[PDB]
Each structure stands twice: as C-alpha cells, then as structure tokens.
Amino acid sequence: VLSEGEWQLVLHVWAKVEADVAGHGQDILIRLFKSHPETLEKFDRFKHLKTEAEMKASEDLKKHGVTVLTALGAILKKKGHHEAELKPLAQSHATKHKIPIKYLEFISEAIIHVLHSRHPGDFGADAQGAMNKALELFRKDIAAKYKELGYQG
Ligand code: HEM
C-alpha cells in the first residue's frame, strides 16, 4: 500500500504529468516503443511506424497517451480505490492486449524514465519509489482482476 505521504508525493509528481498530459502521454509511449519494439508491434496504428516511430508517432499517439494517462491518473487520484472498477480496462488488456501484464512493467519503466528526465531534483528516491509502488499496485490490481475475470486463476 502507499502511505498518505507517499500518495501526496505521487499526486504532486502527477500534477506535473497532468499539467502536460499529452506530452507525458506521447513521450511515455514513444519511449516505451523505442525501448521495447514488441510493445510497438502490438498497437496496429503505431506498428505502422515499424522502426519504433519514424520520428512522427503523433496526433493519434497524443489521443491515446491522453486516454492512457487519464485512466492511470484516475487510479492514482483514487489513492487505492481501483479506478472505481478497473475491470473493463483489465478485460481489454486481458483479452486483446496479449494476456499477461508484462508490457505494463515496460510502461512503468517508461513512466519512471519520463518522470526522472523531465522532473529531476524533485523526482528523487522517495518519489520514484512511491510512483513505482503505485504502478506495482496498479499492475497487482489488474492481476487480481485477471483472477476475478477467470484468466489468472
Ligand atoms: C499505464 C498503463 C495502461 C493504462 C492505464 C491503459 C489504458 C488504456 C485505455 C484507457 C485504453 C482504451 C480502452 C481499452 O481498450 O481499455 C487502452 C487501450 C489499449 N491499450 Fe492500454 N493501457 C495501459 C497500458 C498498456 C500497454 C503497456 C500496452 C501495450 C504495450 C497497451 C496496449 C493497448 C492497446 C493495444 C489498446 C487498444 C487501442 C490502441 O490500439 O490504441 N496498454 N489502454
């Protein structure tokens, strides 16, 4: 779990993400993609830029990145109360997104990378540990939802 302090730190960092949700959103995906080709092959609309983003990966990347961060954002904002549901998103990433979490650990790395890159000095040990823990909770929540939905069970 995350303590009130850890949540406040997370929300503080996230206010910076949210302030430039689109930017973080794109950056995170671009980073994820360039780091792990397999994550890029997955999204048909991004996959077309086969060489992990032909230095474009925009407009649609923005739309998704925003959707994506807003969802994880809501989760984080709800400080443990698992997006009020999570289940529908667990279901998509379960059935369509190629079952196991895996890639969510890659986006966790991407998130940590963008955060550290854009917000050094303040995104220190405590902040990164807190964000990482929050991402781990998120991944763990999806893992539990995969059991509920009758996949991970
Ligand atoms: C921060 C973690 C993530 C969150 C909060 C998230 C959120 C979302 C949301 C809200 C949607 C649209 C509705 C839905 O289908 O559920 C979506 C779709 C999708 N997600 Fe994720 N997602 C996450 C991570 C991932 C990762 C790491 C991958 C693959 C590397 C992935 C691949 C997809 C795909 C392929 C779609 C379908 C739409 C697309 O082609 O753009 N997701 N995601």
Minimal CA–CA distance to 78: which of 129, 5, 10, 153? 10
Domain that holds residue 75: 1-153
Technique behind the model: NMR
Measured from the CB, is residue 31 less than 6 Å from ligand 1?
no
| Domains contained in the chain, number | 1
Closest-lying ligand 1 atom to the alpha carbon of residue 111: 1
**Ligand 1 neighbour 103 (Cβ under 6 A):** yes
Distance between terminal CA atoms of the chain?
A: 23
Check which CATH number belongs to the domain holding 81 and give it: 1.10.490.10
Residue 45 CB–ligand 1 contact under 6 Å: yes
107: left (phi over 0), alpha (psi -120 to 50) or beta: alpha
